[PDB]
Amino acid sequence: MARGVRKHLKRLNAPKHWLLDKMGGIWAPRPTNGPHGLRECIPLILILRNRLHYANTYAETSMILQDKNVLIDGKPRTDPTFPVGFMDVFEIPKVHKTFRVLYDVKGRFTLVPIQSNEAGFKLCRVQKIFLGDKGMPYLSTHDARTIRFPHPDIKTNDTIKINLKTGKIDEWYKFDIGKIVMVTGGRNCGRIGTIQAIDKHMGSYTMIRMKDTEGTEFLTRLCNVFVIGNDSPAVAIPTTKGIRPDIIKNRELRLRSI
Amino acid sequence: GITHDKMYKRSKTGAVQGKWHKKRKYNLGRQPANTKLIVNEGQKISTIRCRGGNIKRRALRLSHGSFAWGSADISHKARILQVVYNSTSNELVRTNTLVKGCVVQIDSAPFKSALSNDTLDKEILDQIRGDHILARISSRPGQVGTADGYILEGPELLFYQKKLAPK
Amino acid sequence: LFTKVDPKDQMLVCELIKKLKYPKVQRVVTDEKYARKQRVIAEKKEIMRKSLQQLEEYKALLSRMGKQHNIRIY
Amino acid sequence: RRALERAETLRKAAYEMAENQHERAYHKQSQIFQGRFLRKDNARCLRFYKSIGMGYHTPITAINGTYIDKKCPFTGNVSIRGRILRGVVHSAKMQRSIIVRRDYLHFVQKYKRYERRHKHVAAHLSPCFRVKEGDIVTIGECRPLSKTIRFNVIKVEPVSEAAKKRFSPF
RNA sequence: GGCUCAGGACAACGGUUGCACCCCCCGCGGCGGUCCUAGCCGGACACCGCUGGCAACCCGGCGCCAAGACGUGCGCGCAAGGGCGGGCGCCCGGGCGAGCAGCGUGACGCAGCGACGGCCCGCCCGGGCUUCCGGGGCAUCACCCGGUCGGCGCGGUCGCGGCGCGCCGAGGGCCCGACGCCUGGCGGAGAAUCAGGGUUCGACUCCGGAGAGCGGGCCUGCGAGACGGCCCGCAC
Ligand SMILES: [Mg+2]
Ligand SMILES: [Mg+2]
Ligand SMILES: [Mg+2]
Ligand SMILES: [Mg+2]
Ligand SMILES: [Mg+2]
Ligand SMILES: [Mg+2]
Ligand SMILES: [Mg+2]
Ligand SMILES: [Mg+2]
DSSP, rough: OEEEEEEEBBBBGGGGGOOOTSSOBBOOOOOOOSSSSSSOOOEEEEIIIIIIIIIHHHHHHHHHHOOOOOOOTTOOOTTTTTTETTTTTEGGGTTTTTEEEEOOTSSOEEEEEEEETTTTTTEEEEEEEEEEEGGGBBBEEEEEEOOOOOOOTTTTTOOOESSSSSEEEEEOOOOTTOOOOOOOSGGGOOOOEEEEEEEEOOSEEEEEEEEEETOOOEEEEGEEEEEEEEESSSOOOOOOOOOOOOOOHHHHHHHHHH | BBBBBGGSOOOOOOOOOOSSSOOOOOOBBOOOOEEEOOOOSOOEEEEEHHHHHEEEEEEEEEEEEEEEETTTTEEEEEEEEEEEESSSSSHHHHHEEEEEEEEEEEESSSHHHTTTOOOOHHHHHHTSSSSEEEEEEEEOOTTTTTOOOOEESHHHHHHHHHHHHHH | OOOSSSSSSOOOOOOOOOEOOOOOSOOOOOHHHHHHHHHHHHHHHHHHHHHHHHHHHHHOOOSSSOOOOOOOOO | HHHHHHHHHHHHOOOOOOOHHSSSSOOOOSSOOOTGGGGEEEEEEOOOOOOOOOOOOOOOOHHHHHOOTTTTTTSSSSOOSEEEEEEEEEEEESSSSEEEEEEEEEEEETTTTEEEEEEEEEEOTTTTOOTTTTTTEEEEESSSSSEEEEEEEEEEEEEOOTTOOOOOOO
């Protein structure tokens, strides 16, 4: 038993959906605690170095970040291991590039470019309502943020729109049958569909049945069902509309691209 | 040192398990406070640095406490005279050692100074016109550094009166 | 050696060795410190006022429901 | 009238328990404030009870009983959470505890056959239930109540006389 | 982080639950009201100067000086704990499957923050324990256990608990193999072999556990019963 917390991370023990080469090295970056957890995040350096390719080493990324060249939800971050998560705003003014971090059908993080009109807010999932000091009602979300004095009409598992400049709630979408959702965990990450059924078991998990646009049906637990509007998405989504092709069609697409 | 780990016990079949590691600091214990009634000397309370930087205070000597008469909603700070009954053992009584559940006699002055003029339970009033009132301890000295309680009421009062009357 | 001292000025003759070397004075308040303290006080007052206003408007709302909070005493 | 009768029995019992001087301590329900028993009227409740919440129903014996048990799931201060299981009674000799027998199957791949296995599980039995050997019980998981006990009985179904012992997976 | 596998055979470990019995640094987001000289408080030590002890290791005395160091502390009432506050066969908001949280009110106590403003709350990683299933061989080991099994009460603990103590009763396990003894016994993900069914191994790359000559004890700290940290016994 280790006598304290863990600070390192072996490369082979890192999450698969990070797509890290086996021979890159013994070690992988260890994300620091923040808005998102280890298994539902991706470090900034990976995006800035292994994807966009604006840097070729750790040091270059360190200089870029300490020179204030990236804003996360309107706030400059200088930590190369800062965790980036789902429905986050990634803006680089020096090149006028703005991206929203979402999931691809394969189950990995992707950068969807956005516009100026929709980059002043983000969507958050409310999963906990509790009373704080002095009995004051509170409310928490998936990105580690708390808001005091929420509307009584807002319940758990709902979705909340908040302005980036000011953490004030505008409108909220209820968790109900007939609402477009997006799956954010498990075997079905990145799929988009509409809720058709809700079944609860006393003392255990609650299972949600969803149907895709094409008629396919799939199941997942409520812990990773994210509402993204009322029958139509509230934000811009990837070019594909949450359709996972079968191995045959993916092979055809690969051969075509070959 | 003192520990409460279960590795040094026997199994449900009565077998010797065996030992596979040295002692750990999470599983430690400490010597009892043995809080004493006062009856260089004065109220003495110590402080203990517990896991996580948390602070725990154990009382070694004390003489006063807050007591409540629930039926009439009367509460004052009163001086504790001596311990008269304890279910665990009579040795604690002889030594006047304070623990949760001890039955004690308190001074009647703070209560009689305002009582004996309103209709209430006869028995508490008969105690009030005397020098002491039977009471109980509800806090945990050794963990919070205090000795509070409440005044006995009905069937429990009869139980303890019948217990201590022959003595 | 040469309380409630408004000017806060001082001497400088000190000692010299050529370069003049004198210890820097500590515990002196000028414009920066006074202004910083005043700004901090104003910020704290503003924060308290905003929180009180938010509580008042929340209480004004919920006219059709029940509330439980620690009443401010004194 | 019905309510008045219940309070008398509840009020009465607390006084015999005070006359049982052989006992060393006075046993009382923590929730109830001792003092209501001197109120001649019946405007204050004298007994505390709760609901398990998993679709089970509180026995009448608990509500109208006159016993004290801090480990009872209905009148006490413990909570049921986790796994619910079923078994048969194997022994009932301790004061408020029993041993439950559970039967299950184990598969062996090499021989493509099964073995019958059993385990013994101890549980706390509240005075609201009557149980004899061979009865079927439902046990709910609780916090550690002792060295070998983490379960409490919440339902009993009787079994008939001289019924042959049978292997009964549940 | 790195090394090794001595010890440990209902344990560790693997999968599956839970804390309505728990603790948690950095970081992210909030919140920020404190009972009874405030143009800025008080005294010291280190380095350093003079004088010195001892083979070495090690330090002594005198003396002016700083703080985001220590102490005191300006301020709209606020820490821990404690008493009282629901029903009438059951079920049909802050929150739950689940009477759980919070609040009011009668008494105690003045803990923490504050001489450039952080006490507190939530999340996160981590840890502690815990349900269920699996978890070596010998019957030239057949009966074993006596805090052993359960109950009541207190104490201690971050916390539940025979974890410890007092009292009471007698129990618990076993041919579906207990108890005892042995192992040139760390476990798993896996490796070798090759029709199919299987046999043998698994020090070593990843995860988890345990140890730093043997046996014990402890300070600092959120976190160590730590050993490139201290104290003792023994062997060197
Ligand atoms: Mg004051
Ligand atoms: Mg200070
Ligand atoms: Mg070995
Ligand atoms: Mg290892
Ligand atoms: Mg070690
Ligand atoms: Mg050591
Ligand atoms: Mg060494
Ligand atoms: Mg080390």
